[PDB]
């Protein structure tokens, strides 16, 4: 029912999804989404590539069961200065101002997400999630999370994360939603076991296979960006180091120096760098899907580098945007060295 229309303008027949928001949107509204940055909206075209079946099932289930009502709660007190956009509204400023108010400013939500320093409310909301996830209500879970529930939260008394619970219950859409808000399939409970483990123990094998795909999402995406293939996780090899183009020539001295510098980063900083490279990959990839889906009109009429994430420093953001300066060969070199060392660091 809800799938027929854009969540942001009511425009018919939408082509993109905002995965973290569980909404389908049209092209125009997407073009504004892409400018907000992944920390606000994570965009993916619905028909251009195959999705993991259960990731798309999750987004479409969420949107058909009141996801948009969390984000538009205030509207549902109706005033003349706060009006939802209509399909024929100009992208600038009509649709844009609305979308930024919907998702960036969180203008229409029932209650804003608690401040990060709010330990007691964060804990309460998080214990609700860690219970709620056992059942199959995705709307409650998105609601809790929007309020500031933490998906990788560790229950001090029960000894487990929401992802453990969903996994032992076979709640795969829940697992999927939680992983979007960065739940970790590799986190051990107090008894030393991963959500992957609870899945297999429960006889939920596709979910187990899916959790492992989620574990390796970052490196899988980097490998695909250069090969058009991903590791075969059922085979047991979990990485895929693409070959460099200059493979017939000896490695140059600055290339060796660059990689030395990269290996020098602590695991924590390295994983931060890889998220950055992940984001740029996702940008360069979406750029091409954009040009492949858009009509000649819309294009010949966003941003040429990663959007600013306000929760990052000006330095972090500068490095992230510096990634757009990389030419194909430079970028491929960074991606290959990040892949071969993600592997090094895990053995």
């Amino acid at each position: 029912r809800s799938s027929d229309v854009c969540a942001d303008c009511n425009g018919p027949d939408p082509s993109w999804a905002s995965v973290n928001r569980g909404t389908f949107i049209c092209d125009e509204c997407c073009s504004v989404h892409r400018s907000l940055g992944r920390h606000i909206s994570q965009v993916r075209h619905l028909k251009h590539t195959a999705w993991p079946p259960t990731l798309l099932q999750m987004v479409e289930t969420l949107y058909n069961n009141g996801a948009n009502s969390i984000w538009e709660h205030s509207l549902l007190s109706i005033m003349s200065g706060r009006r939802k956009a209509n399909p024929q509204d100009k992208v600038h400023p009509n649709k844009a101002e609305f979308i930024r108010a919907k998702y960036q400013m969180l203008a229409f939500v029932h209650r804003l997400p608690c401040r990060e320093d709010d330990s007691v409310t964060a804990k309460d909301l998080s214990k609700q999630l860690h219970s709620s996830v056992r059942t199959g209500n995705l709307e409650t879970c998105l609601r809790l999370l929007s309020l500031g529930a933490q998906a990788n939260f560790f229950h001090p008394e029960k000894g487990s994360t929401p992802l453990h619970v969903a996994s032992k219950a076979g709640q795969i859409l829940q697992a999927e939603l939680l992983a979007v808000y960065g739940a970790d399939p590799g986190t051990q409970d107090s008894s030393g076991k991963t959500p992957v483990d609870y899945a297999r123990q429960g006889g939920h094998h596709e979910l187990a296979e899916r959790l492992i795909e989620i574990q390796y999402e970052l490196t899988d995406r980097l490998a695909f960006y250069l090969c058009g293939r991903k590791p075969d996780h059922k085979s047991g090899q979990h990485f895929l180091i693409p070959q460099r183009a200059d493979a017939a020539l000896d490695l140059s001295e600055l290339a060796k120096a660059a990689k030395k510098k990269l290996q020098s980063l602590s695991n924590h900083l390295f994983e931060e760098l890889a998220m950055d490279v992940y984001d740029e990959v996702d940008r360069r990839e979406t750029d091409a899907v954009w040009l492949a889906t858009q009509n000649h009109s819309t294009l010949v009429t966003v941003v040429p580098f990663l959007p600013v994430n306000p929760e990052y420093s000006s330095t972090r953001n500068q490095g992230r945007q510096k990634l757009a300066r990389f030419n194909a060969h430079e970028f491929a070199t960074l991606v290959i060295d990040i892949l071969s060392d993600a592997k090094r660091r895990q053995q």
Partner: peptide, 16 residues
């Protein structure tokens, strides 16, 4: 954060 971010930024500059 800044001491962490500055390490990342210098790795990135090494690849460009």
């Amino acid at each position: 954060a800044l001491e962490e971010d500055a390490q990342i930024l210098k790795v990135i500059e090494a690849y460009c």
